[PDB]
Design an enzyme around this catalytic site. Structure first.
Site, PDB file in Angstrom:
ATOM      1  N   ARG A   1      -2.386  17.565   0.490  1.00 34.48           N
ATOM      2  CA  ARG A   1      -3.676  17.247   1.061  1.00 34.48           C
ATOM      3  C   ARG A   1      -3.869  18.054   2.326  1.00 34.48           C
ATOM      4  NH1 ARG A   1      -4.596  10.866   2.911  1.00 34.48           N
ATOM      5  NH2 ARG A   1      -5.857  11.294   4.766  1.00 34.48           N
ATOM      6  N   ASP A   2      -5.005  18.716   2.545  1.00 37.90           N
ATOM      7  CA  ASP A   2      -5.212  19.385   3.808  1.00 37.90           C
ATOM      8  C   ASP A   2      -6.151  18.392   4.405  1.00 37.90           C
ATOM      9  OD1 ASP A   2      -6.324  21.098   6.018  1.00 37.90           O
ATOM     10  OD2 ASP A   2      -6.470  22.788   4.768  1.00 37.90           O
TER      11      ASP A   2
ATOM     12  N   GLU B   1      -0.141  17.670   4.137  1.00 43.67           N
ATOM     13  CA  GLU B   1       0.058  16.248   4.096  1.00 43.67           C
ATOM     14  C   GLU B   1       0.364  15.695   2.659  1.00 43.67           C
ATOM     15  OE1 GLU B   1      -2.703  14.536   6.979  1.00 43.67           O
ATOM     16  OE2 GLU B   1      -0.770  14.742   7.916  1.00 43.67           O
ATOM     17  N   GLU B   2       1.073  14.558   2.593  1.00 44.12           N
ATOM     18  CA  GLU B   2       1.391  13.776   1.391  1.00 44.12           C
ATOM     19  C   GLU B   2       1.577  14.476   0.045  1.00 44.12           C
ATOM     20  OE1 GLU B   2      -1.907  11.187   2.044  1.00 44.12           O
ATOM     21  OE2 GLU B   2      -0.901  10.227   3.715  1.00 44.12           O
TER      22      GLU B   2
ATOM     23  N   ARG C   1       0.903  -1.138   0.000  1.00 41.18           N
ATOM     24  CA  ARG C   1       0.000   0.000   0.000  1.00 41.18           C
ATOM     25  C   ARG C   1       0.961   1.211   0.000  1.00 41.18           C
ATOM     26  NH1 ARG C   1      -3.379   4.147   0.154  1.00 41.18           N
ATOM     27  NH2 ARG C   1      -4.966   4.146   1.713  1.00 41.18           N
TER      28      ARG C   1
ATOM     29  N   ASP D   1      -1.528   0.968   9.014  1.00 42.36           N
ATOM     30  CA  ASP D   1      -0.604   1.802   8.279  1.00 42.36           C
ATOM     31  C   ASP D   1       0.825   1.654   8.709  1.00 42.36           C
ATOM     32  OD1 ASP D   1      -2.557   3.352   6.688  1.00 42.36           O
ATOM     33  OD2 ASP D   1      -3.127   4.372   8.543  1.00 42.36           O
ATOM     34  N   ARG D   2       0.984   1.576  10.032  1.00 41.19           N
ATOM     35  CA  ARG D   2       2.327   1.506  10.541  1.00 41.19           C
ATOM     36  C   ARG D   2       2.547   0.417  11.574  1.00 41.19           C
ATOM     37  NH1 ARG D   2      -0.241   5.868  13.121  1.00 41.19           N
ATOM     38  NH2 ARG D   2      -0.944   6.433  11.018  1.00 41.19           N
TER      39      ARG D   2
ATOM     40  N   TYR E   1      -4.824   6.441  -3.639  1.00 36.60           N
ATOM     41  CA  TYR E   1      -3.798   7.450  -3.720  1.00 36.60           C
ATOM     42  C   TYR E   1      -3.349   7.794  -5.118  1.00 36.60           C
ATOM     43  CZ  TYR E   1      -2.797   7.907   1.180  1.00 36.60           C
ATOM     44  OH  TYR E   1      -2.812   8.323   2.493  1.00 36.60           O
TER      45      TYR E   1
ATOM     46  N   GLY F   1      -9.353  21.311   4.460  1.00 40.96           N
ATOM     47  CA  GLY F   1      -9.405  21.165   3.001  1.00 40.96           C
ATOM     48  C   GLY F   1     -10.036  19.952   2.293  1.00 40.96           C
TER      49      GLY F   1
ATOM     50  N   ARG G   1     -13.101   6.369  -2.468  1.00 41.46           N
ATOM     51  CA  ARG G   1     -12.040   6.296  -3.439  1.00 41.46           C
ATOM     52  C   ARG G   1     -12.490   5.274  -4.478  1.00 41.46           C
ATOM     53  NH1 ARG G   1      -7.837   5.589   1.524  1.00 41.46           N
ATOM     54  NH2 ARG G   1      -7.610   7.776   2.111  1.00 41.46           N
TER      55      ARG G   1
END
Ligand SMILES: *[C@@H]1O[C@H](CO)[C@@H](O[C@@H]2O[C@H](CO)[C@@H](O[C@@H]3O[C@H](CO)[C@@H](O)[C@H](O[C@H]4O[C@H](CO)[C@@H](O)[C@H](O)[C@@H]4O[C@H]4O[C@H](CO)[C@@H](O)[C@H](O)[C@@H]4O[C@H]4O[C@H](CO)[C@@H](O)[C@H](O)[C@@H]4O)[C@@H]3O)[C@H](O)[C@H]2NC(C)=O)[C@H](O)[C@H]1NC(C)=O
Ligand SMILES: *[C@@H]1O[C@H](CO)[C@@H](O[C@@H]2O[C@H](CO)[C@@H](O[C@@H]3O[C@H](CO)[C@@H](O)[C@H](O[C@H]4O[C@H](CO)[C@@H](O)[C@H](O)[C@@H]4O[C@H]4O[C@H](CO)[C@@H](O)[C@H](O)[C@@H]4O[C@H]4O[C@H](CO)[C@@H](O)[C@H](O)[C@@H]4O)[C@@H]3O)[C@H](O)[C@H]2NC(C)=O)[C@H](O)[C@H]1NC(C)=O
Ligand SMILES: *[C@@H]1O[C@H](CO)[C@@H](O[C@@H]2O[C@H](CO)[C@@H](O[C@@H]3O[C@H](CO)[C@@H](O)[C@H](O[C@H]4O[C@H](CO)[C@@H](O)[C@H](O)[C@@H]4O[C@H]4O[C@H](CO)[C@@H](O)[C@H](O)[C@@H]4O[C@H]4O[C@H](CO)[C@@H](O)[C@H](O)[C@@H]4O)[C@@H]3O)[C@H](O)[C@H]2NC(C)=O)[C@H](O)[C@H]1NC(C)=O
Ligand SMILES: *[C@@H]1O[C@H](CO)[C@@H](O[C@@H]2O[C@H](CO)[C@@H](O)[C@H](O)[C@H]2NC(C)=O)[C@H](O)[C@H]1NC(C)=O
Ligand SMILES: *[C@@H]1O[C@H](CO)[C@@H](O[C@@H]2O[C@H](CO)[C@@H](O)[C@H](O)[C@H]2NC(C)=O)[C@H](O)[C@H]1NC(C)=O
Ligand SMILES: *[C@@H]1O[C@H](CO)[C@@H](O[C@@H]2O[C@H](CO)[C@@H](O)[C@H](O)[C@H]2NC(C)=O)[C@H](O)[C@H]1NC(C)=O
Ligand SMILES: *[C@@H]1O[C@H](CO)[C@@H](O)[C@H](O)[C@H]1NC(C)=O
Ligand SMILES: *[C@@H]1O[C@H](CO)[C@@H](O)[C@H](O)[C@H]1NC(C)=O
Ligand SMILES: *[C@@H]1O[C@H](CO)[C@@H](O)[C@H](O)[C@H]1NC(C)=O
Ligand SMILES: [Ca+2]
Ligand SMILES: [Ca+2]
Ligand SMILES: [Ca+2]
Lengths: 107, 389, 389, 389
Positions: free
Chosen positions: C213-214, C197-198, C38, C71-72, C325, C218, C291
C-alpha cells in the site's frame, strides 16, 4: 468510610518533655496510619506513614505507633517550635479520612 | 526432555526488557468465565510455558467472588492454563489443592507442591508427575507456607524453601531437597538473614539463588544462595542502599548486608532480583508505601556493596497503576548460549483499595531480557472498576 | 514437515474462486465470548491452517469493547484459533504481544513477529518456535510496523517487510531476512516505489512477491519482488489502469508503473494481487471511496502493461456490504502439481460507519482458486447492528 | 499400559488422609456452564485420573435444572472430565447413555457400563474401548442397577456387581465377569448377605473387595470378596458395632456379621471401607439420620470382630455441612511399593433439604492416604443457596 477520632483536642507539655497524641479508627485499619503536622500558618508535613515509618527527614523525636483501631504519635525533647496542629490520616481504604487534630501547646 | 536438567549455562546480558506475556484477565473477565485468582507465577516445561496461580474457586462476576481478600480457604486450588490466556473455568488445569504452592519441572516430569489447612494443622503434599508422592506436616503449627514462584531443579534435586512460624516474629524456615517427589534432605535456615518469606528463585551455573521477603524487620531483601549439588545454603541481605521491599523507608546512601535495614516492620510484598555482579537488576514497586508502579533498576554489585546506586532503569507499571507480587522464572530448555532472564508482575485489582467491588483479583505482565537496549512501555492491567457496578 | 520448505512449485490456473473459510464471528459474537479483533490474516502450518488476528483484549459484548477503534494499545495480542471458528476466549492461542504482526512457518517451526510500543520507542520481538529469539528496536522512532499478513519462507530464509517512519511522508522501509528467528541480513527499500505499507506476500518458484500500500501518494500498489535465495529485492508500481487501492480516483485508460498514480493521498487499505502474466488476478473494493464490496478481476499482464483492463471477474462481497483489509496466503504443504492461490477479506463491523455501537470488530471470508469456472455467491459478515442495542 | 494389569501389591499403611481433589462445582456453577449431576465417583487410567458422574442434562442455572431429584430419566448421561475441574458443558466427555453406571480400566482400554430404561424393561450396554460391545437385559424387570463406583480389573477379568429386583424386598443380585467387554461368567449372590446395592470396590493382592448397602434391613454393610482369578465370591456383613449405613440405629457394643443389624429399614446411602486387619478404616456420615458430616475411623479387625470400636479418626466434612454418597478408588498404575488408599465423598446440594431451589446437584471431595499422621481440615461444598434466588 473509616472514621478517625482524635481526642484530646489540645495538649500542653513542657520544653524537653514527652507528649503523645492519640488517634483511633472505627475498624482495624491494619496499621495504615499517616501523621501530618501543620505548623501555624503553613502547610502540613508528612511525618510518619504506616503508623511508624518516618518520612524523609523527620528527626527521630517523633515516634509513630499503634495497631488495630488504636494508634498514638509520641514526640520527645519537645521544642518550642513543636507547636502545631497534628492530624492522623488513614491510608488503608478510600476515601482517605483525617482526624480532628490536636494542638500541642508548650507549657 | 527425556533426561533430567543441569543448569549449565549462566545469565545473558540484561540490557533492557521485552514483553513476554500479558493475560488481560480482569479486562476480559468482565464478560467471560475468568476465575478469581491471586499469587500468580510462571513456569516452564521443556515443551511449553504456562501461567500458574492460586484460584479462589469462583468466577470474578460470580456472586461467590465477594470476599476473596482472604488468602486461605478450602476453595483455593493451584491452577495452570496457557501462556497469555485468562484463567478460564473451561481451560485451567488444577495442579493440587491448597493455599500456598510452588511448582517446577525437573527435566522429566514436574513437581507441584500445595499446602492446605487450618492455620495450626497445615500439611504440604508434594505431587510428582501429577501423582501425590510425599506429604510433610506443620513443624511449628502456625501457617506452613512456601514460595509462590517456581523452584529450580538440578540433576533431579530441586531445593524448595518452606517457612512455618510467625510472620511477626522469628519463624522457623527450612530448605527441603526433593528428587522425584521424595525428600532427599532438609536443613534449617542459616546465614545472617533474620526471617524468610516467599522466595523468588533462578538457577545458573549449578547454583540456585533466592531473593525473598523479611516480613519482620526487613526493608532490604534476604538472599539465600543454595547449592543443589551439595545440598548446602547461606543467607545474607542485599548490601545496596536501593531498598526494594514494600513498604520501606526511603533509600539511604549506605545500605545493610548482614541485618535487616530498619524501618518498616511486620510487612513486605514478594519480590525478586537477578544477582550477577555488573549485571545485577533489582525490581521494586515505585511507591514507598503501596503496591503501585513497578521498575527494574540496574544496580551493579548490589549484593556485595553497601553503596550501590542504580545506573540504568526501565519502567514496567506506572506509579498511577497497581502492581503486587513479582518473582523470577527462566526457560531452562530455551536453546541459547545463556539463560534469558525473566520475571513476572502480578497486577492486583479489587479490595482493599478499590473496595467499590467486593472481590480482589489480578492479571499478569511478564518480561524477559534483551541485550539490545529496547524502548520501554508501561503495561496496565487495564480494567475500569466502574463497569462491574 | 521435519525439513525446511523450498517454494518449488508455481501457481495453478486461477479460473474462478471457491469458499475456503468463513468464521461468522460478529453473528455468533452477539451471544458467545468472541473476542474483539481487527487486522486478520490466515497462515498454514505443514499440518493445519488457522486464522490469525490482532485481538483488542475484550469480548464484543464486554463493556471494554467500547473504543476499539484505536489501532494500538497495550491490550492488543496476536492470536490464532482453528480455521472457521470464532476468536473465542476459550480457544484462541496467543502468539506474542503487540499491535502489528506477521507470522509464518518455515517448514520446521514458525516465526511470529509482534511489534509493541509507544509510537516513538517501538520494539519488535521475533518469536521462533514459540520462544522469543530476537528483538529489533525503532530506527526512525515513528511507529514501527510490519505486514499484517504471513511471510513466506524458502530454505529457512523468510523475508519480512518492516516500515518505520511517516505514513504521510517518506518513511523508512526495510526488508529483513530471518532464518530460525536470527537476522540474516536487512536491506533498505529499493526500486521506484515511493512508500511501502502492509505488504501481502505469496511465494512461487523460489521468489516471493509482495503487493503493498502506498499511503502517501499511491492509488496504484507498489509491488516488491524479493529473492530469498540471494537476499535481494526491487520495487515498482503495477502498470494497469485498473486502480486497486482505496480511496482512489476512478481508473484511467493508461495507468503508471514507476510512480504513484496521482489522486488519493495520505490514505489506502491493505490489499493483495496474484501477479503471473496471463494469470494475473487483482483484488479491489468496489467503492472508490469506502471499504464496501470486494471483487477479483483478471487483468492479464497487469504488472507490466500501462493499458491492462480486466477480462473475467468474480464478486466476493457486494457493494452494499462492508469489507476491509485483504491479503494473500497459500498452503505450501498442500499436495499438488501447483500452488492453489488464496486470499482472505476482513469484514469490518462497527465504528466509524456503524457508530450506533461503540466497538469496531470484524469477521473473515477466505477463498482459494479453482480451475473449473465455478458460479459465484457474495458472502456478507451477516450481523444486524440492531441486536446489540 | 500396553498390557493388562494384575493387582500385585497390597494397601499402604493408612495413618491419616490428604486432599486429593476438590472440584468446587456448585460454587463455580453459580456463573459458568457447570452441569447438574449426582452419583459421582473417580477412576484412573494408566495415564490420568478423572471425575465421573451421572449428568442430568441441564446446566445448574438452566431452567431445565428444576426437578433433578429424579434419579432416572432419559436425559441422564455418564460423563467424565479432568480431575478437579467442574463438569462443564464444554469439557465433559460422555461415556455412554443411562442412569446407573460403572467404569474402569483394565490396563489396556476401559470398560464403561451404562444401564438405561423403563423400570421394567431396563438394559445394560457394556462399552469397551469407547465402542458398544455387549448388552444384558433385565432379569427381574424391576430396575436393573449397578455400582456407581469403578470396578476393578485383574488379568483382563473385571468383576461387576449388578442388582435387579426389589430395593424393599429380596432382590436378585449377580456378579458378572467381563473380559474385554465380553461376559466371561455370571453367578448369583452367595453368602449370608441379605440384599446388595451400590457396591464400592478396591483390589489388592489379586482379590477384589466390595463394601455395599443393604437397603432392606441393613444398617451394617454387606461385604462381598470376589476372586477375579477363579471367578468366585462370598458375602457377609461387617462384624463391628460401629454402624456405617445411613440412617442407622445408634451403634451397639456388639455388632453383627452374618445378618443385617436391625433398626433402619428400607433405606441406606452408598458407602465404602478399606478392610485390612489392623489397618481397617471405615467411613460413615456423622448424622444417624441424615447425609451430613463424613468421617473416617480406624476400627481394627472390623470385618471379623463383633466388638471393634475405633482407635483413631479424621473428619472430612463437618456435621453442619452436607455429604452423600462415598466409594473407593485407587491409582493401580501409581508407582510405589503399595496401593495408596483413596475415597471420594459426594456433596449433595439442593432438593429435598435446600428446597428453596428446585434443582438437586453436588460437588466432590476426594482423599488418598498418607503414612504420616497429617493434620485434618474439613471440606465444605461451599455454595450459598441464597445466591441462586
Ligand atoms: C525510550 O526508551 C528508553 C529505554 O527504556 C528510554 O531510556 C531509559 O529511560 C529511563 C527513564 O528515563 C532511564 O531510567 C533512569 O535511569 C537512571 C540512571 O541514569 C536511574 O537513576 C533512574 O532511577 C531512579 O529514578 C526513578 C525515577 O526517575 C526512580 O523511580 C527510581 O526509583 C530511581 O531513583 C530512586 O532511587 C535512587 C537510588 O537509591 C535514588 O538515588 C533517587 O534519589 C530515587 O529515590 C526516590 O525514589 C525511590 C522510589 O520511588 C524511593 O524508594 C526513594 O526513597 C526516594 O524516594 C531511572 O530508572 C533508563 O536508564 C533509560 N535507559 C536507556 C537504555 O536509555 C528513553 O528515555 C525512551 N525515549 C523516549 C524519547 O521516550
Ligand atoms: C454464475 O456465476 C458465474 C461465475 O462467476 C457468472 O459469470 C461471471 O459474471 C461476472 C459478473 O457478471 C463477470 O464479471 C465481469 O467480467 C467482465 C469481463 O468481461 C469485467 O469487465 C467486469 O468487471 C468490471 O465491472 C464490474 C461491475 O460489472 C466493476 O465493479 C469492475 O470494477 C470492473 O469495471 C470497472 O473497471 C474497468 C477497468 O478499468 C472499467 O473498464 C469499468 O468502466 C469499471 O469502472 C468503474 O468501476 C470501478 C470500481 O467500481 C471504479 O474504480 C472505476 O473508476 C469506475 O468507476 C465483471 O467482473 C465474470 O466475468 C463472469 N465469469 C465467468 C466465468 O463467466 C454468471 O454470470 C453467473 N450466472 C448467473 C445466471 O447468475
Ligand atoms: C490436628 O489434626 C490431628 C489429625 O487429624 C488431630 O488429631 C485427631 O483428632 C481427631 C478428633 O480429635 C481424633 O479422632 C477421634 O479419635 C478417637 C480415638 O481415640 C475416636 O474415638 C473418635 O471417634 C468417635 O468420636 C467422634 C466424635 O468425636 C464420633 O463422631 C465418631 O462417630 C466416634 O464415636 C462414636 O462411635 C463410637 C464407636 O461405636 C462410640 O464409642 C461413641 O460413643 C460415638 O457414638 C455416637 O456417634 C456415632 C456417630 O455420630 C453414632 O452412630 C452413635 O450411635 C453415637 O451416637 C475421633 O475420631 C483422631 O484420633 C486424632 N488423630 C491423630 C493422628 O491424632 C488433632 O487433634 C489436630 N490438632 C489440633 C490442635 O486441632
Ligand atoms: C458480600 O457482598 C455483599 C454485597 O453483594 C455484602 O453486603 C453488604 O454487607 C454488609 C455486612 O457486611 C451489609 O450490612 C450491607 O448492607 C451489604 N450492603 C452492600 C451495599 O454491599 C457482604 O457483606 C459481602 N461479604 C460477604 C462475606 O458476604
Ligand atoms: C464508552 O461507551 C459509553 C457508552 O457505553 C460512551 O458514553 C458516552 O460518552 C460521552 C463522552 O464521550 C458522554 O457524554 C455521553 O453522554 C455518553 N452517552 C452515550 C449514550 O453513550 C463513552 O464515551 C465510550 N467511550 C469510552 C472511551 O469510554
Ligand atoms: C419447575 O420450577 C417451577 C419454578 O421455576 C415450579 O413452579 C411451581 O410449581 C407449582 C406446581 O408444582 C406451582 O403451583 C407454583 O405456583 C410454582 N411456583 C413457584 C414459586 O415455584 C415447578 O413446579 C417446577 N417443577 C417442574 C417439574 O416443572
Ligand atoms: C548433571 O550434573 C551431575 C553433577 O551435578 C553429573 O554427574 C551428571 O552426569 C550431569 N548430567 C548431564 C546430562 O549433564
Ligand atoms: C532447498 O533449496 C536450496 C537452494 O535454494 C538447496 O540447496 C537445498 O538443498 C533445497 N532443499 C530441499 C529439500 O529442496
Ligand atoms: C497376571 O496374572 C496371571 C495369573 O492371575 C498370570 O498368569 C499372568 O501371566 C500375569 N501377567 C502379568 C504381566 O503379571
Ligand atoms: Ca519489611
Ligand atoms: Ca493511497
Ligand atoms: Ca439400611
Amino acid at each position: 468510610d473509616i472514621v478517625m477520632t482524635q481526642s484530646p483536642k489540645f495538649m500542653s507539655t513542657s520544653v524537653g518533655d514527652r507528649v503523645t497524641i492519640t488517634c483511633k479508627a472505627s475498624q482495624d485499619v491494619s496499621t495504615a496510619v499517616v501523621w501530618y503536622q501543620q505548623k501555624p500558618g503553613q502547610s502540613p508535613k508528612l511525618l510518619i506513614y504506616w503508623a511508624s515509618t518516618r518520612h524523609i527527614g523527620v528527626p527521630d523525636r517523633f515516634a509513630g505507633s499503634g495497631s488495630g483501631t488504636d494508634y498514638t504519635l509520641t514526640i520527645s525533647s519537645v521544642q518550642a517550635e513543636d507547636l502545631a496542629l497534628y492530624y492522623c490520616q488513614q491510608h488503608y481504604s478510600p476515601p482517605w479520612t483525617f482526624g480532628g487534630g490536636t494542638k500541642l501547646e508548650i507549657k | 526432555i527425556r533426561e533430567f536438567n543441569n543448569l549449565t549455562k549462566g545469565l545473558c546480558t540484561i540490557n533492557s526488557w521485552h514483553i513476554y506475556g500479558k493475560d488481560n484477565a480482569v479486562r476480559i473477565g468482565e464478560d467471560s468465565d475468568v476465575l478469581v485468582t491471586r499469587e500468580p507465577y510462571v513456569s516452564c516445561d521443556p515443551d511449553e510455558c504456562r501461567f500458574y496461580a492460586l484460584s479462589q474457586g469462583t468466577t470474578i462476576r460470580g456472586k461467590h467472588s465477594n470476599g476473596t481478600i482472604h488468602d486461605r480457604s478450602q476453595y483455593r486450588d493451584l491452577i495452570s492454563w496457557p501462556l497469555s490466556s485468562p484463567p478460564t473455568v473451561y481451560n485451567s488445569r488444577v495442579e493440587c489443592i491448597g493455599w500456598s504452592s510452588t511448582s517446577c519441572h525437573d527435566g522429566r516430569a514436574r513437581m507441584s507442591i500445595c499446602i492446605s489447612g487450618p492455620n495450626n494443622n497445615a500439611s504440604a503434599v508434594i505431587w510428582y508427575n501429577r501423582r501425590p508422592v510425599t506429604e510433610i506436616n506443620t513443624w511449628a503449627r502456625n501457617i506452613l507456607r512456601t514460595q509462590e514462584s517456581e523452584c529450580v531443579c538440578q540433576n533431579g534435586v530441586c531445593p524448595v524453601v518452606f517457612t512455618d512460624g510467625s510472620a511477626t516474629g522469628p519463624a522457623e524456615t527450612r530448605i527441603y531437597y526433593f528428587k522425584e517427589g521424595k525428600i532427599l534432605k532438609w536443613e534449617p535456615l542459616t546465614g545472617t538473614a533474620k526471617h524468610i518469606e516467599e522466595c523468588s528463585c533462578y538457577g545458573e551455573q549449578a547454583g540456585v539463588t533466592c531473593t525473598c521477603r523479611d516480613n519482620w524487620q526487613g526493608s532490604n531483601r534476604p538472599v539465600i544462595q543454595i547449592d543443589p549439588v551439595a545440598m548446602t545454603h547461606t543467607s545474607q541481605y542485599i548490601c545496596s542502599p536501593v531498598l526494594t521491599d514494600n513498604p520501606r523507608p526511603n533509600d539511604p546512601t549506605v545500605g545493610k548486608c548482614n541485618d535487616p535495614y530498619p524501618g518498616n516492620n511486620n510487612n513486605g510484598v514478594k519480590g525478586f532480583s537477578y544477582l550477577d555482579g555488573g549485571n545485577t537488576w533489582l525490581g521494586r514497586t515505585i511507591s514507598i508505601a503501596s503496591r503501585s508502579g513497578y521498575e527494574m533498576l540496574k544496580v551493579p554489585n548490589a549484593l556485595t556493596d553497601d553503596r550501590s546506586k542504580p545506573t540504568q532503569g526501565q519502567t514496567i507499571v506506572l506509579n498511577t497503576d497497581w502492581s503486587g507480587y513479582s518473582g523470577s522464572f527462566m526457560d531452562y530448555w530455551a536453546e541459547g548460549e545463556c539463560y534469558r532472564a525473566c520475571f513476572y508482575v502480578e497486577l492486583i485489582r479489587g479490595r482493599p483499595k478499590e473496595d467499590k467491588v467486593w472481590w480482589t483479583s489480578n492479571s499478569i505482565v511478564s518480561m524477559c531480557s534483551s541485550t539490545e537496549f529496547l524502548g520501554q512501555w508501561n503495561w496496565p492491567d487495564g480494567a475500569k472498576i466502574e463497569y462491574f457496578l
